[PDB]
Design a protein around this nucleic acid. Structure first.
Ligand SMILES: [Mg+2]
Ligand SMILES: [Mg+2]
Ligand SMILES: [Mg+2]
Ligand SMILES: [Mg+2]
Ligand SMILES: [Mg+2]
Ligand SMILES: [Mg+2]
Ligand SMILES: [Mg+2]
Ligand SMILES: [Mg+2]
Ligand SMILES: [Mg+2]
Ligand SMILES: [Mg+2]
Ligand SMILES: [Mg+2]
Ligand SMILES: [Mg+2]
Ligand SMILES: [Mg+2]
Ligand SMILES: [Mg+2]
Ligand SMILES: [Mg+2]
Ligand SMILES: [Mg+2]
Ligand SMILES: [Mg+2]
Ligand SMILES: [Mg+2]
Ligand SMILES: [Mg+2]
Ligand SMILES: [Mg+2]
Ligand SMILES: [Mg+2]
Ligand SMILES: [Mg+2]
Ligand SMILES: [Mg+2]
Ligand SMILES: [Mg+2]
Ligand SMILES: [Mg+2]
Ligand SMILES: [Mg+2]
Ligand SMILES: [Mg+2]
Ligand SMILES: [Mg+2]
Ligand SMILES: [Mg+2]
Ligand SMILES: [Mg+2]
Ligand SMILES: [Mg+2]
Ligand SMILES: [Mg+2]
Ligand SMILES: [Mg+2]
Ligand SMILES: [Mg+2]
Ligand SMILES: [Mg+2]
Ligand SMILES: [Mg+2]
Ligand SMILES: [Mg+2]
Ligand SMILES: [Mg+2]
Ligand SMILES: [Mg+2]
Ligand SMILES: [Mg+2]
Ligand SMILES: [Mg+2]
Ligand SMILES: [Mg+2]
Ligand SMILES: [Mg+2]
Ligand SMILES: [Mg+2]
Ligand SMILES: [Mg+2]
Ligand SMILES: [Mg+2]
Ligand SMILES: [Mg+2]
Ligand SMILES: [Mg+2]
Ligand SMILES: [Mg+2]
Ligand SMILES: [Mg+2]
Ligand SMILES: [Mg+2]
Ligand SMILES: [Mg+2]
Ligand SMILES: [Mg+2]
Ligand SMILES: [Mg+2]
Ligand SMILES: [Mg+2]
Ligand SMILES: [Mg+2]
Ligand SMILES: [Mg+2]
Ligand SMILES: [Mg+2]
Ligand SMILES: [Mg+2]
Ligand SMILES: [Mg+2]
Ligand SMILES: [Mg+2]
Ligand SMILES: [Mg+2]
Ligand SMILES: [Mg+2]
Ligand SMILES: [Mg+2]
Ligand SMILES: [Mg+2]
Ligand SMILES: [Mg+2]
Ligand SMILES: [Mg+2]
Ligand SMILES: [Mg+2]
Ligand SMILES: [Mg+2]
Ligand SMILES: [Mg+2]
Ligand SMILES: [Mg+2]
Ligand SMILES: [Mg+2]
Ligand SMILES: [Mg+2]
Ligand SMILES: [Mg+2]
Ligand SMILES: [Mg+2]
Ligand SMILES: [Mg+2]
Ligand SMILES: [Mg+2]
Ligand SMILES: [Mg+2]
Ligand SMILES: [Mg+2]
Ligand SMILES: [Mg+2]
Ligand SMILES: [Mg+2]
Ligand SMILES: [Mg+2]
Ligand SMILES: [Mg+2]
Ligand SMILES: [Mg+2]
Ligand SMILES: [Mg+2]
Ligand SMILES: [Mg+2]
Ligand SMILES: [Mg+2]
Ligand SMILES: [Mg+2]
Ligand SMILES: [Mg+2]
Ligand SMILES: [Mg+2]
Ligand SMILES: [Mg+2]
Ligand SMILES: [Mg+2]
Ligand SMILES: [Mg+2]
Ligand SMILES: [Mg+2]
Ligand SMILES: [Mg+2]
Lengths: 94, 61, 103, 44, 77
RNA sequence: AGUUGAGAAGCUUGCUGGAGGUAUCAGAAGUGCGAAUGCUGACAUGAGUAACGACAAUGGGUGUGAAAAACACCCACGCCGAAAGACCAAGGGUUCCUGCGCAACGUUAAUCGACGCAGGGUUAGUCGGUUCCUAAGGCGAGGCUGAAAAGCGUAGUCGAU
RNA sequence: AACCCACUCCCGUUGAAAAGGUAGGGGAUGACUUGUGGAUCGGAGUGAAAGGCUAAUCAAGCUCGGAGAUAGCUGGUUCUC
RNA sequence: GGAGUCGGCAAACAGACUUUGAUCCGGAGAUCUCUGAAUGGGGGAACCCACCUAGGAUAACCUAGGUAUCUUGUACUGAAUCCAUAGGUGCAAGAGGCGAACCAGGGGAACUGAAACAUCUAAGUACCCUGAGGAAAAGAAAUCAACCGAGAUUCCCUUAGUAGUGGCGAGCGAACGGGGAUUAGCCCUUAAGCUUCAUUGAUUUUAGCGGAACGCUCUGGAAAGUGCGGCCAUAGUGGGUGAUAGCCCCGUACGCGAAAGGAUCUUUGAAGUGAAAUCGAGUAGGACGGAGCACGAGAAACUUUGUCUGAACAUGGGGGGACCAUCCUCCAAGGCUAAAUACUACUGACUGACCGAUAGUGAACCAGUACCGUGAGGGAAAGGCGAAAAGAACCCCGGAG
């Protein structure tokens, strides 16, 4: 993968109560990634930027909610989410 | 950063101007996600600075 | 080029504030101006505690049409019309009555 | 009682789909007729 | 399809008129058969779908001259 | 409202309205409505009348609340149980969970909801696809046929049940 | 029995339902029932044949054009003397 | 250009940009995801799976290019078969699809009218299909006239609803001759003309610049209105500004303007084409079955051809409405050719004894939308506070309604 793609796969961390508990209980962090990022690319970008060692990545696609307005039906974008598991002891700074 | 001084550099010097800018944009995306970004204008400013470099880097060929 | 510019000394012709003088503060779109100290209004705002705190009754100027004012010529102490003098290198606005540049 | 419309997405696409209109020339006149009217859908 | 190879004769249309003068659409088709022509120079037979009028033209001009005209307009046989 | 003509109609004024109207004589007409089981909206009568969708069934206590037959919890009754329980496929598409709400929707009320607003939620080498193979059938380089569009079909490549 | 069907009565007919329900009824290892995919159609298809079925439409579907078809037939046709 | 700006519904709150020239407008360029003729192979359009070449990474790839089919040309190559033919590869050039109408062709109805209905009409219309162009087609007499003459094609007005034609019914319908719009001809002993270039000049188009002349008074929330007196005019019935403005703003008459693109017309050089080689033979003429000529077999001439035949060579051949004789007039079987003519989906300016929200487009509004249908397809309703949001602070009843 070229040197451009490293900075373009990760779209930032995902903030929720479930991600907060995962990061503490079992060292598993949740990220927002590009809709075409593969597990191999996500694993390499985290290793290259955050200077941690990644063992497994599980990924899922999320549908965009549809909100009904006075002008008809409108929907938000579809995004992609990844759960990244690290070594038993090490954290991921920001 | 203007396009006048971008044409004072070589193709060798123009390819870490882009790498530095791309890393700079990445740090801004991370701040925007966590809500600790007050300099809202920096997001679009770096977007046009990347596109400016890619144009000059193409006028050479 | 604009016949009426920001921070100009003008006099109001036509309207309730006719005869008054002031400085131009803003030049809005759709041919409207905001002259400081004239065409004052009162606006009452309900102070919802959420999303910041709000007050009571505020004082502010209201816009008026750009053709209801005129440049005040401090040579005859009365309103005049402007024109764009033929340029040696740049347009200069001058008074029609006296053929002198505006300041 | 059994009604006339029994949905199936596979059979919907193979009779009224985009690639089914483009196969025959009479189906290509249907697509161009809907483009002229200005239809938003244009396909099933 | 049903067109003479050497003259381009094709189907045309017309009417059938009865004794009470009722008219119905019909067609007139060329009288075209399959035939093999021995090309003396080429040392081989050539098969065409020519009408009986095209067989008379090949008599008058030869198969060498008729074939060259077919080649010119790309009418591969 | 008053008045004037034989009539279609004209004239003058009170109140409302808040910016346009057109004498006279001519010229042009999308020129006059009660009917067409006329067309489009609004509103009556029937009439506060029928009905409120399986005849398994409900009774108390407590809580919240502006307000409780219907919401939540407790005690006690009934009903299904080769289903009215549980799970796959099709089909649907956020209806799933949480906080805040009750205008409209719910054939009654609603503090409740498959309803409104906002946030969250779906993690696979082994599960189902895709990838490999073909059935019926389809398309089909050349080809053969056909006024033209085109029809049939070989090599081939699609097509799961 | 499940499943497929529809012989009788009553209810319902502004229906719970533009063809149902409760009670009884026929077949139920076969000329059986059924899921998925595919083929045949408008003077054409399919039919153990009722002129039946071909999207609640059938002695010739639906849709858009010829088209404002034609109507010696009904209806209607607006201010004053 | 010359001071504000970060598109609208659509407002608020934040971050900012700039006279060291922003936002904005015009010319040129760069980027240009997936789908669609879609073209590397498939496919349920917006998806799935690849191969080859070059360079770069060492791991489970990246960047940048090629890989459809057919036609024409070209190089190599090679079956039955000896030679070579069919075939097979590799390179180039071209096409493909869309578009409201106009044009040239291929196929081609019925309702209806005839107060029934077959011939006939409707009508070579509707529709389907193919091809080209900014126009297309046709065009330089084997044409007419009538013993006098005209002189290519196309379009308009007459001749004329006439001569004809017609179950001689309903109907269809010329030409000769006149008046006009346009003006042009050139070649097969190789030409006009047309394209593509490279030059010589001019004009237009894509943005802009200057653009004159009014004060006082009364009513009024507000003058442009009342009254009095002036000024400008190649600019005086434009738009809107707090009620009705030549002199308040934007404009208007009139003049100026283009770094750079497009287009048109002119010179003058090049190449290609025109182009069919050599004046026209399976052609003219003929018989049978149709079509077109206004002309429906009729005394029925002329053009065209599905079947079958078939001349002469300027002392020769075609036509002059059956046919013959005499006269007159043209030279078919090879080509190219502008203008006058047809249309408008699209762009600009101006205008209207056109509409004013049940009207005018189906659509003034987020309309080919909502909704209806498996689909093709059908198809709505819905404008206005005020000059300016100054859009109602604060108190009271009520569920923080
Ligand atoms: Mg997964
Ligand atoms: Mg979206
Ligand atoms: Mg007939
Ligand atoms: Mg009155
Ligand atoms: Mg007005
Ligand atoms: Mg009048
Ligand atoms: Mg009327
Ligand atoms: Mg009446
Ligand atoms: Mg009425
Ligand atoms: Mg009536
Ligand atoms: Mg009446
Ligand atoms: Mg009625
Ligand atoms: Mg009525
Ligand atoms: Mg009532
Ligand atoms: Mg009663
Ligand atoms: Mg009663
Ligand atoms: Mg009752
Ligand atoms: Mg009941
Ligand atoms: Mg009931
Ligand atoms: Mg009930
Ligand atoms: Mg209880
Ligand atoms: Mg209680
Ligand atoms: Mg109850
Ligand atoms: Mg029990
Ligand atoms: Mg699904
Ligand atoms: Mg919802
Ligand atoms: Mg729920
Ligand atoms: Mg709640
Ligand atoms: Mg209720
Ligand atoms: Mg209540
Ligand atoms: Mg909800
Ligand atoms: Mg396979
Ligand atoms: Mg097969
Ligand atoms: Mg096929
Ligand atoms: Mg083929
Ligand atoms: Mg396969
Ligand atoms: Mg397969
Ligand atoms: Mg399977
Ligand atoms: Mg069943
Ligand atoms: Mg039966
Ligand atoms: Mg029965
Ligand atoms: Mg029965
Ligand atoms: Mg009984
Ligand atoms: Mg039984
Ligand atoms: Mg029963
Ligand atoms: Mg038995
Ligand atoms: Mg099927
Ligand atoms: Mg079919
Ligand atoms: Mg039919
Ligand atoms: Mg019978
Ligand atoms: Mg039948
Ligand atoms: Mg039916
Ligand atoms: Mg019929
Ligand atoms: Mg039909
Ligand atoms: Mg009618
Ligand atoms: Mg008709
Ligand atoms: Mg009547
Ligand atoms: Mg009356
Ligand atoms: Mg493609
Ligand atoms: Mg393909
Ligand atoms: Mg492809
Ligand atoms: Mg084409
Ligand atoms: Mg024809
Ligand atoms: Mg007929
Ligand atoms: Mg008549
Ligand atoms: Mg008749
Ligand atoms: Mg009749
Ligand atoms: Mg009859
Ligand atoms: Mg006819
Ligand atoms: Mg062209
Ligand atoms: Mg031409
Ligand atoms: Mg002539
Ligand atoms: Mg003579
Ligand atoms: Mg006769
Ligand atoms: Mg100007
Ligand atoms: Mg001026
Ligand atoms: Mg007013
Ligand atoms: Mg004015
Ligand atoms: Mg004034
Ligand atoms: Mg040629
Ligand atoms: Mg000749
Ligand atoms: Mg010859
Ligand atoms: Mg002949
Ligand atoms: Mg003959
Ligand atoms: Mg004839
Ligand atoms: Mg003949
Ligand atoms: Mg002949
Ligand atoms: Mg002749
Ligand atoms: Mg003759
Ligand atoms: Mg000639
Ligand atoms: Mg020509
Ligand atoms: Mg309307
Ligand atoms: Mg109105
Ligand atoms: Mg409408
Ligand atoms: Mg639908």
């Amino acid at each position: 993968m070229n040197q451009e793609r490293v900075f373009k796969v990760l779209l930032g961390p995902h903030i929720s109560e479930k991600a907060t508990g995962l990061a503490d209980g079992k060292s598993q962090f949740v990220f927002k990634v590009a809709t075409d990022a593969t597990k191999l690319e996500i694993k390499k970008a985290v290793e290259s930027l955050f200077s941690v060692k990644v063992q497994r990545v599980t990924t899922l696609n999320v549908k965009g909610k549809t909100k009904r307005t006075a002008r008809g039906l409108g929907k938000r974008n579809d995004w992609k989410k990844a759960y990244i598991a690290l070594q038993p002891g090490q954290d991921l700074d920001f | 950063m203007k396009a006048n001084e971008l044409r004072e550099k070589s193709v060798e010097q123009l390819n870490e101007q882009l790498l530095g800018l791309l890393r700079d944009q990445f740090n801004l995306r991370m701040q925007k996600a966590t809500g600790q970004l007050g300099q809202s204008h920096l997001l679009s400013q770096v977007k046009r600075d990347i596109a400016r470099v890619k144009t000059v880097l193409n006028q050479q060929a | 080029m604009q016949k009426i510019r920001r921070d100009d000394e003008v006099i109001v012709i036509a309207g309730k504030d006719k005869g008054k003088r002031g400085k131009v503060l803003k030049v809005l779109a759709d041919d409207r101006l905001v002259v400081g100290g004239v065409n004052l209004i009162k606006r009452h705002t309900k102070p919802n505690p959420m999303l910041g705190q709000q007050g009571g009754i505020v004082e502010k100027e209201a816009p008026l049409h750009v053709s209801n004012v005129a440049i005040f010529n401090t040579e005859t102490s009365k309103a005049d019309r402007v024109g764009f003098k033929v340029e040696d290198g740049k347009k200069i606005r001058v008074f029609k009555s006296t053929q002198k540049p505006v300041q | 009682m059994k009604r006339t419309f029994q949905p199936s997405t596979l059979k919907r696409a193979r009779v009224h789909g985009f690639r089914a209109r483009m196969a025959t020339k009479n189906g290509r006149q249907v697509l161009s007729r809907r483009r002229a009217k200005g239809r938003k859908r244009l396909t099933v | 399809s049903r067109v003479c190879q050497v003259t381009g004769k094709g189907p045309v249309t017309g009417n059938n008129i009865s004794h009470a003068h009722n008219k119905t659409r019909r067609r007139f088709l060329p009288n075209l058969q399959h035939h093999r022509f021995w090309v003396e120079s080429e040392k081989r037979f050539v098969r065409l779908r020519v009408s009986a009028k095209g067989m008379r033209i090949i008599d008058k001009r030869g198969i060498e001259a008729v074939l060259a005209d077919l080649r010119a307009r790309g009418e591969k046989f």
